[PDB]
Amino acid sequence: RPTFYRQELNKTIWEVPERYQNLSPVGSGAYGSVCAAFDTKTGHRVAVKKLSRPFQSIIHAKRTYRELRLLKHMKHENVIGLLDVFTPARSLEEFNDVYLVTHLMGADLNNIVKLTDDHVQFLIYQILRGLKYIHSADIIHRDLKPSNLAVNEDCELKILDFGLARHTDDYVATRWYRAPEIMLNWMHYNQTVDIWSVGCIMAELLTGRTLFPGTDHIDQLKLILRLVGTPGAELLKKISSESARNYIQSLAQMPKMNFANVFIGANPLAVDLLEKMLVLDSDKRITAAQALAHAYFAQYHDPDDEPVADPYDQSFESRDLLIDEWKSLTYDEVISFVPPP
Ligand SMILES: CCn1c(Nc2ccccc2Cl)nc2cnc(Nc3c(F)cccc3F)nc21
């Protein structure tokens, strides 16, 4: 079994197999911290995440289990998956730390502000291809924003589950990229909430500006409505919340702007696609599979290399278990891990 070493990196002790060398902080978040490392087995560079306090509560414990489950499942070129998972623990009884290893990508899409239409085509194509895969397993991301999209200098893109709150060397609000139907509650929505976010991102790649930079959830709705217009009866009748129905309607007249105007200069096929992604009504927004068949992506679309995922068991999400139950289940997933070839 591997020999582990210890190293202190900004007040966190890291304990990793000797295989991973040259640990270099990349950043941190509320759910963990991440280093770059060199993997001597493959001669490639990887990212290593040390989960922060994985079993400190039933909510940490459930999150820890979710992340491991989800990441073991993801096997697609445009979705971050697991190269490795490890713990210094030699038994369940000493199990209190979880480390996850993936490809190092070296930047997030937000940093790509530090693009031709072909560039936008390729980036958005890859997001949609990863989303086809995720969505096919009945997984919804629910917080897609540029800081959750890992990108190489190659322009290859992988969807991350969680990005960095702080980078080392060295801001992106969820609500800017969130669909209107989930802006106040979670009562009526499906996988297309992710498609809205894609539209927001695609808009920002085309224009260099945040599309809907709301100062809060009410102002977010106001910026959104200014562009897509006030909804008519067919959408207002599907809204249950009296509060939501009232803000959506209580506006100094909001005309559906001409995406033609808003995005003048763009490939008209981009504008068309944007118009189908940024549809207010969740039930009529284009899906990832439909968006991939859009003529905007004719340079890249190949239906024979846009795979779907194996069946994913999300039943645990309904469960309310004890910390030690989640911990044992997590440990099971750790022990059973089989690395990719
Ligand atoms: C959120 C950090 N992060 C993870 N997290 C993760 C997720 C699931 C399982 C294991 C990990 Cl480490 N994997 C990454 C791969 N590549 C890079 N690149 C990179 C960078 F080097 C600098 C700034 C931004 C970046 F995206 N970041 C990663």
UniProtKB/Swiss-Prot annotation:
Activated by cell stresses such as DNA damage, heat shock, osmotic shock, anisomycin and sodium arsenite, as well as pro-inflammatory stimuli such as bacterial lipopolysaccharide (LPS) and interleukin-1. Macrophages, monocytes, T- and B-lymphocytes. Isoform 2 is specifically expressed in kidney and liver. Its cofactor is Mg(2+). SMART domains: S_TKc. The gene is Mapk14. Its main location: cytoplasm. One of its GO terms (biological process) is stem cell differentiation. The keyword Glycoprotein does not apply. Dual phosphorylation can also be mediated by TAB1-mediated autophosphorylation. TCR engagement in T-cells also leads to Tyr-312 phosphorylation by ZAP70. Dephosphorylated and inactivated by DUPS1, DUSP10 and DUSP16. PPM1D also mediates dephosphorylation and inactivation of MAPK14. Signal peptide: none annotated. It comes from Mus musculus. The lineage of its organism: Eukaryota, Metazoa, Chordata, Craniata, Vertebrata. This is Mitogen-activated protein kinase 14. The modification Phosphothreonine is found at residue 12. ATP binds at residues 26-34, 49. GO terms for molecular function: ATP binding; kinase activity; MAP kinase activity; mitogen-activated protein kinase p38 binding; NFAT protein binding; protein kinase activity; protein phosphatase binding; protein serine kinase activity. The TXY motif contains the threonine and tyrosine residues whose phosphorylation activates the MAP kinases. The modification N6-acetyllysine is found at residues 49, 145.
